Amino acid sequence: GVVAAAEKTKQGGVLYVGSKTKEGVVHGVATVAEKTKEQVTNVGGAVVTGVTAVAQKTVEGAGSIAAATGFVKK
Amino acid sequence: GVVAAAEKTKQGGVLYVGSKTKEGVVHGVATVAEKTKEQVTNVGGAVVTGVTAVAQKTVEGAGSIAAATGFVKK
Amino acid sequence: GVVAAAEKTKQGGVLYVGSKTKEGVVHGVATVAEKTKEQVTNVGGAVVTGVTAVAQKTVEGAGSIAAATGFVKK
Amino acid sequence: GVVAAAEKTKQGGVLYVGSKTKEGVVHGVATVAEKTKEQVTNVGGAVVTGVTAVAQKTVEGAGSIAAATGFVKK
Amino acid sequence: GVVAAAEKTKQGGVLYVGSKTKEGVVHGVATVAEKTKEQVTNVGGAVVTGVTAVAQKTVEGAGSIAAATGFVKK
Amino acid sequence: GVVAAAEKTKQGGVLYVGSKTKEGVVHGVATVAEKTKEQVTNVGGAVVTGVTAVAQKTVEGAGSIAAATGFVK
Amino acid sequence: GVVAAAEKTKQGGVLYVGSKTKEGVVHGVATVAEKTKEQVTNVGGAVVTGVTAVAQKTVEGAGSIAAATGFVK
Amino acid sequence: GVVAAAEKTKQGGVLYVGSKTKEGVVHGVATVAEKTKEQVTNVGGAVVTGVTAVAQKTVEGAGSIAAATGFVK
Amino acid sequence: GVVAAAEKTKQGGVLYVGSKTKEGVVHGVATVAEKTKEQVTNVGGAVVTGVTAVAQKTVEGAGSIAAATGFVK
Amino acid sequence: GVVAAAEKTKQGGVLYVGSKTKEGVVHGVATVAEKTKEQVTNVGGAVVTGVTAVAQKTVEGAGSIAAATGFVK
């Protein structure tokens, strides 16, 4: 039993960024292996992966993640 | 039993970015293997992967992820 | 039983980006292998993968993902 | 079992950044192995991974993560 | 079992950064191994990993993380 | 004066190479620039640029090179 | 006066290489610039640039190189 | 007076290499600059630049190099 | 003057290398600069730059190098 | 003046190397600068720059190098 559930019910300044780069190299979420079995990646939020990365008011309601890896069980 | 469920019921400034690059190299979500078995990737949110990446008010309601890999079980 | 379900009922400034690049290389969601068995990728949200990427008000209601790989069971 | 649940019900200045780089190299969340079994990554929050990385008002309600790895159980 | 629950019910100056860098190398969360079994990473908050990294009002409500790794039971 | 001269006068085993590659990338003589004025390249001998390169008894008599660049005068 | 001269007169074993590679990247002679004026390259001998490179009895007579760059005068 | 001269007159076992690699990256003679004026490269001998490089009896007679750079006069 | 000269006249066991590598990175002769004026490289001998490099009986007669950089006068 | 000269006239066992390496990084001759004027490199001998480097009977006759940097006058 792997169960997730989400409910979201409702009875409903200045941000300046200035950048100047030369030869940038960026890696975000990485996963490197040799001789593995499972590679599982779940995203319920935000991944902002620029050279200039700006996130405003991003992750704001009712997230749910359920995972179950492995489980030989015999 | 792998179950997900989502419900969303509702009785219903300035952001400046200025950039200047030369030879940018960007990677985002990556998954590298040799001799693996499963590669599972679930996205319920946002992946913003520019050289300039801006996200405003993005992930805002009722997400659900359920995953189950492996399970030899016999 | 691999079940998803989603419901959404409703009883109903300035963003500036200025960019200047020379020879940028961008990747996004990636999955590389040699000698694998399963490669599963599910998107329920958003993947914005420009050189300049802007995402405003994107993922805003009632998503659900249910996944089940592997499961030898014999 | 592996259960997650999230509920969200509601009865509803200046930020300056100026950067100037030359040959920056950035890694965010990384995971390297040789001869592992499981590589699991769950994101319910935010990952901001720039050369200039700005997050404002980002992670603000009702998140839940549940994970279960291994479990030989026989 | 592995349960995680979250609820969030409700009856609802100037910050200057100036940088000037040359040859910067940044790493964030990292996990390097060889001959392991599990590599689990759960993110419920924020990970800001710039050369200049700014976070404001970022992690502000109702998170929950549950995990279970191992459990040989034999 | 840019003068060259070359004279040649004459009054008259086992080699084994076994290779096995996968994904090779080779560069030989290169020259990369941005905003040059002169890019001069002279070859009087041998340039052998294989994935597997074998040279045997190649450059064996009377070579000459004379080069004169620049001279803003 | 850039002068080169060469003269050559003549009044007249097992070698084993075994290689096995994967993911090979080779650079030989390289010259990289940004905002230069002169890039001069002369070869009178041998440039052998394999992944597996073998040279046997290669450079064996009468070589001359004469170069003269610059001279803003 | 940049002069080079060369003369050459004549009155006329086992070698084993065994290699096994994975992920090889080789650079030979390299030159890297930013905002230079002259980049001069003369080869009179041998440049052997493999992942496995073998040179046997290679550079064996009468070489000459002459070079003159700069000279703002 | 920048003068070179070379003359060469003649009135006329077992070697074993066994290698095994993983993730090899080799540089040889290198030159790196920023905001230079002259970069000169002369090779009159041998440059052997492998991951497995073997040179046998290589540099064996009558070499000469001359060089003159600068000279603002 | 910058002169060189070379003459070479003539009136005419077992070696075993075994290597085992993993994650190996080798450098050789290097010259790294920022805001220099001249960078000169002459080779009249041998530069053997492997992960496994072997040089047998290599440098054996009549070399000469001359160099003159500077002379502001």
Cβ atoms of residues G49 and H28 within 8 Å: yes
Q: Do chains B and C touch (3 or more CB pairs under 8 A)?
A: yes
In terms of DSSP bridges, do strands D69-70 and A69-70 run parallel, antiparallel, or are they unpaired? parallel
Q: Which chains touch I (3 or more CB pairs under 8 A)?
A: G, H, J
- Which residues of chain C neighbour B44 with C-beta distances below 8 Å? 44-45, 59, 63, 65
- Which residues of chain F neighbour H38 with C-beta distances below 8 Å? 70
Q: Which chains touch E (3 or more CB pairs under 8 A)?
A: A, D
Q: What is the DSSP string of chain H?
A: -EEEEEEEEE---EEEEE---SSEEEE-SEEE-SS-SEEEEEE-SEEE--SEEEEES-B-S-EEEEEE-----
Number of CB atoms found within 10 A of residue A10's CB: 19
G27 is in an annotated binding site: yes
Written as six digits, the tokens of H35 are 């905002």
Contact: A21, D25; criterion CB under 8 Å = no
Between CA J4 and CA I71 the distance in angstroms is 19
In terms of DSSP bridges, do strands G38-43 and H38-43 run parallel, antiparallel, or are they unpaired? parallel
Tell me which chain B residue has its CA closest to the CA of residue C14: B14
Written as six digits, the tokens of B38 are 């499963």
What are the helix (H) ranges across chain C?
A: none
- Cα distance between the two ends of chain E: 18
Burial of D13 from C-beta contacts in 10 A (0-12 / 13-18 / 19+): exposed
Cβ atoms of residues G59 and H27 within 8 Å: no
Tell me which chain H residue has its CA closest to the CA of residue G24: H24
- Which residues of chain B neighbour A61 with C-beta distances below 8 Å? 59-62
- Measure A60 CA to nearest chain C CA, in Å: 10
Residue (of G33, J41, J70) closest to F38 by Cα position: G33
- Which residues of chain F neighbour G41 with C-beta distances below 8 Å? 29, 31, 40-42
From residue E57, alpha-carbon distances to A14, A56, B42, E61, F73 in Å are 15, 10, 28, 11, 67
The gap from C-alpha J67 to its chain's centroid, in whole angstroms, comes to 15
Number of CB atoms found within 10 A of residue A11's CB: 12
3-class secondary-structure state, position A42: strand
**Interface H-I: count of C-beta contacts within 8 A:** 287
Q: Which residues pair with G25 in a beta bridge?
A: F25, H25
Between CA H22 and CA H39 the distance in angstroms is 34
Residue (of A30, A47, A40) closest to A65 by Cα position: A40
Written as six digits, the tokens of B28 are 């985002």
Buried b / exposed e over F6-20, threshold 16 CB at 10 Å, is: bebeeeeeeeebebe
Q: Which chains touch G (3 or more CB pairs under 8 A)?
A: F, H, I
Q: Which residues contact J45 (CB under 8 A, 6 or more apart)?
A: I45, I59, J58, J59, J63
Handedness of CA E39, E44, E45, E48 (dihedral sign): positive
Residue found by looking up tokens 């592992």 in the block: D36
Contact: D25, E25; criterion CB under 8 Å = yes
Residue (of J27, F64, F30) closest to H39 by Cα position: F30
Cβ atoms of residues B40 and A31 within 8 Å: no
Q: Do chains B and H touch (3 or more CB pairs under 8 A)?
A: no
Q: What is the DSSP string of I8-65?
A: EEE---EEEEE---SSEEE--S--B-SS-SEEEEEESSEEE--SEEEEES-B-S---E
Q: Phi and psi for D36 in degrees, rounded to 5? A: -105, -175
Between CA H2 and CA G65 the distance in angstroms is 10
In terms of DSSP bridges, do strands H2-10 and G2-10 run parallel, antiparallel, or are they unpaired? parallel
Number of CB atoms found within 10 A of residue G39's CB: 27
Contact: B55, A56; criterion CB under 8 Å = yes
Q: E strands along chain D, which residues?
A: 2-10, 14-18, 24-29, 38-43, 46-48, 52-56, 63-66, 69-70
Between CA C63 and CA B66 the distance in angstroms is 12
Contact: H50, I50; criterion CB under 8 Å = yes
Between CA D8 and CA A66 the distance in angstroms is 18
Q: Which residues contact C47 (CB under 8 A, 6 or more apart)?
A: B43, B46, B47, B49, C28, C29
Written as six digits, the tokens of G72 are 């803003």
Write down the experimental method used for this entry: cryo-EM
DSSP E59: B
Q: E strands along B1-74, which residues?
A: 2-3, 6-10, 14-18, 25-26, 38-43, 46-48, 52-56, 65-70
Tell me which chain H residue has its CA closest to the CA of residue I54: H54
Q: Do chains G and H touch (3 or more CB pairs under 8 A)?
A: yes
Between CA G31 and CA F33 the distance in angstroms is 8
3-class secondary-structure state, position C2: strand
Between CA F41 and CA H39 the distance in angstroms is 12
Between CA H61 and CA H7 the distance in angstroms is 9
Between CA H67 and CA I4 the distance in angstroms is 10
Tell me which chain D residue has its CA closest to the CA of residue A47: D47
Between CA B44 and CA A46 the distance in angstroms is 9
Residue (of D50, E49, E23, C15) closest to B52 by Cα position: D50
- Stretch 11-70 of chain G: residues touching chain H, C-beta under 8 Å: 11-70
Binding-site residue set of F: 27
DSSP E74: -
Between CA I64 and CA C1 the distance in angstroms is 83
Cβ atoms of residues H30 and I31 within 8 Å: yes
J71: left (phi over 0), alpha (psi -120 to 50) or beta: left
Closest CB to D39: pick one of A15, A20, A38: A38
Between CA G28 and CA H50 the distance in angstroms is 8
The gap from C-alpha E6 to its chain's centroid, in whole angstroms, comes to 17
Q: Which residues contact B66 (CB under 8 A, 6 or more apart)?
A: A2, A3, A4, A66, A67, B2, B3, B4, C65, C66, C67
Burial of D60 from C-beta contacts in 10 A (0-12 / 13-18 / 19+): buried
Cβ atoms of residues D59 and E58 within 8 Å: yes
**Interface G-I: count of C-beta contacts within 8 A:** 3
Q: What is the DSSP string of chain F?
A: -EEEEEEEE----EEEEE---SSEEEE-S--B-SS-SEEEEEESSEEE--SEEEEES-B-S---EEEE-----
Cβ atoms of residues G1 and H5 within 8 Å: no
Cβ atoms of residues B62 and A6 within 8 Å: yes
- Which residues of chain A neighbour E72 with C-beta distances below 8 Å? none
DSSP J57: S
3-class secondary-structure state, position E39: strand
Residue (of E46, F17, I58, C44) closest to J44 by Cα position: I58
Written as six digits, the tokens of J60 are 């054996």
Written as six digits, the tokens of J15 are 């070696």
From residue E26, alpha-carbon distances to D30, D50, E23, H47 in Å are 12, 10, 10, 38
**Backbone break loci in chain E, preceding residues, C–N > 2.5 A:** 12
Burial of D28 from C-beta contacts in 10 A (0-12 / 13-18 / 19+): buried
Residue found by looking up tokens 């704001």 in the block: A60
Q: Phi and psi for B44 in degrees, rounded to 5? A: -120, -15
Q: Within 13 Å, how many C-alpha atoms sit on residue F30's CB side?
A: 20
Cβ atoms of residues A28 and B49 within 8 Å: yes
Number of CB atoms found within 10 A of residue F31's CB: 19
Between CA B39 and CA C31 the distance in angstroms is 8
- Measure H12 CA to nearest chain J CA, in Å: 10
Tell me which chain F residue has its CA closest to the CA of residue H7: F62
Q: Do chains G and F touch (3 or more CB pairs under 8 A)?
A: yes
Residue (of J22, D58, B34) closest to E56 by Cα position: D58
Cβ atoms of residues F62 and G8 within 8 Å: yes
Cβ atoms of residues H51 and H24 within 8 Å: yes
Q: Which residues contact D74 (CB under 8 A, 6 or more apart)?
A: A72, A73, A74, E73, E74
Between CA A26 and CA F65 the distance in angstroms is 47
Tell me which chain F residue has its CA closest to the CA of residue H47: F47
- Which residues of chain G neighbour F38 with C-beta distances below 8 Å? 37-40
Between CA H65 and CA C55 the distance in angstroms is 63
Question: CA torsion angle for C35, C38, C44, C45 (degrees, to 10)?
Answer: -20
Number of CB atoms found within 10 A of residue E32's CB: 12
- Which residues of chain G neighbour I38 with C-beta distances below 8 Å? 70
DSSP J29: S
Between CA H63 and CA H56 the distance in angstroms is 18
